[PDB]
Curated annotation (Swiss-Prot):
Expressed ubiquitously with the most abundant expression in thymus, testis, small intestine and colon. Residues 7-255 form the Protein kinase domain. The lineage of its organism: Eukaryota, Metazoa, Chordata, Craniata, Vertebrata. One of its GO terms (cellular component) is intracellular membrane-bounded organelle. It is found in: Nucleus; Chromosome; Cytoplasm; Cytoplasm, Cytoskeleton, Microtubule organizing center, Centrosome. This is Serine/threonine-protein kinase Chk1. Interacts (phosphorylated by ATR) with RAD51. Interacts with and phosphorylates CLSPN, an adapter protein that regulates the ATR-dependent phosphorylation of CHEK1. Interacts with BRCA1. Interacts with and phosphorylates CDC25A, CDC25B and CDC25C. Interacts with FBXO6, which regulates CHEK1. Interacts with PPM1D, which regulates CHEK1 through dephosphorylation. Interacts with TIMELESS; DNA damage-dependent. Interacts with FEM1B; activates CHEK1 in response to stress. Interacts with TLK1. Interacts with XPO1 and YWHAZ. Interacts with CDK5RAP3; antagonizes CHEK1. Phosphorylated by ATR in a RAD17-dependent manner in response to ultraviolet irradiation and inhibition of DNA replication. Phosphorylated by ATM in response to ionizing irradiation. Ubiquitinated. Mono or diubiquitination promotes nuclear exclusion. Ubiquitination and degradation are required to terminate the checkpoint and ensure that activated CHEK1 does not accumulate as cells progress through S phase, when replication forks encounter transient impediments during normal DNA replication. 'Lys-63'-mediated ubiquitination by TRAF4 at Lys-122 activates cell cycle arrest and activation of DNA repair. The gene is CHEK1. Keywords: ATP-binding, Cell cycle, Chromosome, Cytoplasm, Cytoskeleton, Disease variant, DNA damage, DNA repair, Isopeptide bond, Kinase, Nucleotide-binding, Nucleus, Phosphoprotein, Serine/threonine-protein kinase, Transferase, Ubl conjugation. The chain holds residues 3 to 280 of 476 of the full protein. GO terms for molecular function: ATP binding; histone H3T11 kinase activity; protein domain specific binding; protein kinase activity; protein serine kinase activity; protein serine/threonine kinase activity. It comes from Homo sapiens (Human). Its main location: nucleus. It is linked to Oocyte/zygote/embryo maturation arrest 21: An autosomal dominant, female infertility disorder characterized by zygote development arrest due to failure of pronuclei fusion.
Length: 270
């Protein structure tokens, strides 16, 4: 069919360090995709993206290189970032946060199951489709932590300070999986309180010290119900060897608490 390979770039969705993300619309089919334009890092992001296929991971359609510029054809998520669904200093309804947290765990289980660590889980990297389905986005900082069933310990300092695990700041080497678990716990905190608990998880940070001293009568913890707060007490554990694993997060009481109705389907009476 002539013209199927032509895409019109209709609007800028976001701009940053990389370059820009544009909304692309197919000339013939009107299919909408997100095009990530990176002017030469990208080689590892494309290589990790080629391994991915899960309903809670941003789809990779392909890549095109035009000189020194790489074009990443990625899933268009019309709901934008989870970040904008979080009301400052409030959060969001607890059943919405639980559903997003379930979907976040499904995505992370998938990535860890294929030996991939995202290393930068935050609400800006969690996108929502038209049906409010969560998708893990941007694999620019991602790496392989398990290869030929052999675990590789990490030492590289990366992520975003309010979401990083304390072992990344205190230890030379650390296991990849507990780091992503920790950042998921900070995401859950943000969804339920509309605020980040600390600037970084270090002894010099007063808010982090208060949490370790179990001062849950302070913000953000006082805004969180005791059932999701008991889960946060198991995720936000300083020792990564004692920190809860994803199989045990799936056994948590709040994680399994019936709270949300399914999407309202159209109905009529008489
Ligand atoms: N890497 C990456 C990436 C970034 N955006 C993707 N898809 C979107 O549809 N993104 C998007 C949609 C809307 Br509506 C508003 C903003 C964005 N983003 C722009 C670039 C930053 C990203 O966090 C979200 C897919 N993958």
């Amino acid at each position: 069919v002539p013209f199927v390979e032509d895409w019109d770039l209709v609007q800028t969705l976001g701009e940053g360090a990389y370059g820009e993300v544009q909304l692309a619309v197919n000339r013939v089919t009107e299919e909408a995709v997100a095009v990530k334009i990176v002017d030469m890092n990208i080689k590892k992001e494309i290589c990790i993206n080629k391994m991915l296929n899960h309903e809670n991971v941003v789809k990779f359609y392909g890549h095109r290189r035009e000189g020194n510029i790489q074009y990443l054809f990625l899933e268009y998520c019309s709901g934008g970032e989870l970040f904008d669904r979080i009301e400052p200093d409030i959060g969001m309804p607890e059943p919405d946060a639980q559903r997003f947290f379930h979907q976040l765990m499904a995505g992370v289980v998938y990535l860890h199951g294929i030996g991939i660590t995202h290393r930068d889980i935050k609400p800006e990297n969690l996108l929502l489709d038209e049906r409010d389905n969560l998708k893990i986005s941007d694999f620019g900082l991602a790496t392989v932590f398990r290869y030929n069933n052999r675990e590789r310990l990490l030492n590289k300092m990366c992520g975003t300070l309010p979401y990083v695990a304390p072992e990344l700041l205190k230890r030379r080497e650390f296991h990849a999986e507990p780091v992503d678990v920790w950042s998921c716990g900070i995401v859950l905190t943000a969804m339920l309180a509309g605020e980040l608990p600390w600037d970084q998880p270090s002894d010099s940070c007063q808010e982090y010290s208060d949490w370790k001293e179990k001062k849950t009568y302070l913000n953000p913890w006082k805004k969180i119900d005791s059932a999701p707060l008991a889960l946060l007490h198991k995720i936000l554990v300083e020792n990564p060897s004692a920190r809860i694993t994803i199989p045990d997060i799936k056994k948590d009481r709040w994680y399994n608490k019936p709270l949300k109705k399914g999407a309202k389907r159209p109905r009529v009476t008489s």
